[PDB]
Amino acid sequence: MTEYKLVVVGACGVGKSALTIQLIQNHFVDEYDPTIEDSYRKQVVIDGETCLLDILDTAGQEEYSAMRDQYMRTGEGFLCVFAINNTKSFEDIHHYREQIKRVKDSEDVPMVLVGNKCDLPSRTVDTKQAQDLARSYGIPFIETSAKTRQGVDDAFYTLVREIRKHK
Ligand SMILES: *CCC(=O)N(CCC(=O)Nc1ccnc(-n2ccnc2C)c1Br)c1ccnc(-n2ccnc2C)c1Br
Ligand SMILES: Nc1nc2c(ncn2[C@@H]2O[C@H](COP(=O)(O)OP(=O)(O)O)[C@@H](O)[C@H]2O)c(=O)[nH]1
């Protein structure tokens, strides 16, 4: 069966790990715990096709570190994550997208824009700003909450669909 290497990028604290832990381990915990189980693999069925998801979480890596460069060049698709209550994380998306484009030497890389923490009443980045940005990039935009599980599976499955359209 086909294996998809999905890379999760974005500023520290946007919820890249919480999104991964929900998808793979079925839970959310607010407290940071680095001793949690190291599973990043899940067998799943998307649009009838059975596949294996391998999630490469860039959290905890220094920017420009070797492991981060390795994750990016082996990754087939990218989730570009910002938090809806973190303006700077949204402004940083352009930087993460340009970096993926450089490391892949491609102007057409499968990507999904993810607006995380959509359970928060606290909102400094509007849906329209994110929809206009994803439209200019020609990529899907998905609103998620790693806390309530809203849009989580949709964001990773939409990325797999983007990889398939590309191939
Ligand atoms: C800038 C903040 C952090 O990056 N960070 C570390 C977060 C981290 O490494 N998370 C992470 C990376 C890769 N895999 C997993 N993971 C385990 C199981 N499944 C997955 C997806 C995870 Br959980 C961070 C966050 C919060 N606090 C701290 N911290 C503790 C003490 N001092 C500091 C700043 C850190 Br370093
Ligand atoms: N309210 C809320 N908090 C979240 C959500 N996702 C992550 N967080 C919290 O935001 C903090 C940072 O998340 P983390 O997954 O470690 O971010 P990362 O650095 O991008 O991997 C933690 O306290 C999480 O519990 C979410 O959807 N909603």
How far is CA 23 from each of CA 73, 81, 99, rounded to the nearest angstrom? Answer: 23, 15, 25
Give the resolution to one decimal, in Å.
2.2
Quote the ligand 1 centre to 105 CA distance (angstroms): 29
Distance CA 93, CA 137 (A): 11
Q: Which atom of ligand 1 is nearest to the CA of 12?
A: 1
Per the CB < 8 A criterion, the answer to whether 50 and 1 are in contact is: yes
Q: Is the CB of 17 inside a 6 Å radius of any atom of ligand 1?
A: yes
Does domain 3-166 match CATH 3.40.50.300?
yes
Experimentally determined by:
X-ray
Determine if ligand 2 sits within 6 Å of the CB of residue 97: no
The DSSP secondary structure of 53-111, one letter per residue, reads EEEEE-TTSPTT-HHHHHHHHH-SEEEEEEETT-HHHHHTHHHHHHHHHHHHT-S---E
Domain range list for the chain = 3-166
